[PDB]
C-alpha cells in the first residue's frame, strides 16, 4: 500500500509524510464554506490485492494557523461528515485494487463570526491529516502523514 499526491510526490510502503499544496477560494463570506477537497490531491492503491484487503481510515485531522483561528470545520470522509479538528478515528475505506483511487477526504470550513480580513495566509500550514493503513493479512499499522499548505491568501469580507 502506498500513496502519492497530484504532482507525484509519494509516500511508500510503510508510511511516512508528505506536503500537499492546495489552491483555495480567494474570497469566502461568513455563511459560506471554504472547501478543501483532498480527493483530487491524494491517491492510494493496494500492492497485493490478489490476497490482501487494505483498510484505510482518517485517524485524525488537526487544524493550524488561520483555519484553527478563523474557521469552524467539518471533514467529510467517504461522504460522511465529522467534526474537524477531529474527535475520533473514522470508519474504514477499503483499497482492493492496484489502480490509484482517491483518498476520499474533504474539509468544509466556514468562517467564525469574529473572522475578517486575511483569514488564511499564503504558504501557511492549514491542516495535518493522518491516514492510517492496516490490513487483513498481518500486523502492519502504518501512518501516512499529509501536511496541507495554502498556496494563496483567503480573505473574509467585512
Ligand X SMILES: CCCCCCCO[C@@H]1C[C@@H](O)[C@H](O)[C@@H](CO)O1
**Member of 116, 140, 143, 145 binding ligand X (CB under 6 A):** 140
| 46 forms part of the interface with ligand X (CB under 6 A) | yes
Q: Site map for ligand X, 50-79, x if CB under 6 A?
A: --x-x-------------------------
Nearer to ligand X, 50 or 114 (CB): 50
Residue 44 half-sphere exposure toward CB, CA atoms < 13 A: 30
Nearer to ligand X, 48 or 83 (CB): 48
**Member of 17, 48, 83, 97 binding ligand X (CB under 6 A):** 48
| 13 forms part of the interface with ligand X (CB under 6 A) | yes
Amino acid at each position: 500500500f502506498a500513496c502519492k499526491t497530484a504532482n507525484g510526490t509519494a509516500i511508500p510502503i510503510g508510511g511516512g509524510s508528505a506536503n500537499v499544496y492546495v489552491n483555495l477560494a480567494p474570497v469566502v463570506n461568513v455563511g459560506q464554506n471554504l472547501v478543501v477537497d483532498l480527493s483530487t490531491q491524494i491517491f492510494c492503491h493496494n500492492d497485493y490485492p490478489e490476497t490482501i484487503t487494505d483498510y484505510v481510515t482518517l485517524q485524525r485531522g488537526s487544524a493550524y494557523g488561520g483555519v484553527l483561528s478563523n474557521f469552524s470545520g467539518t471533514v467529510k470522509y467517504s461522504g460522511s461528515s465529522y467534526p474537524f479538528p477531529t474527535t475520533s478515528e473514522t470508519p474504514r475505506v477499503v483499497y482492493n485494487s492496484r489502480t490509484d483511487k482517491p483518498w476520499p477526504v474533504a474539509l468544509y470550513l466556514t468562517p467564525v463570526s469574529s473572522a475578517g480580513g486575511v483569514a488564511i495566509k499564503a504558504g501557511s500550514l492549514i491542516a495535518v491529516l493522518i491516514l492510517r493503513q492496516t490490513n487483513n493479512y498481518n500486523s502492519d499499522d502504518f501512518q501516512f502523514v499529509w501536511n496541507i499548505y495554502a498556496n494563496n491568501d483567503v480573505v473574509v469580507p467585512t
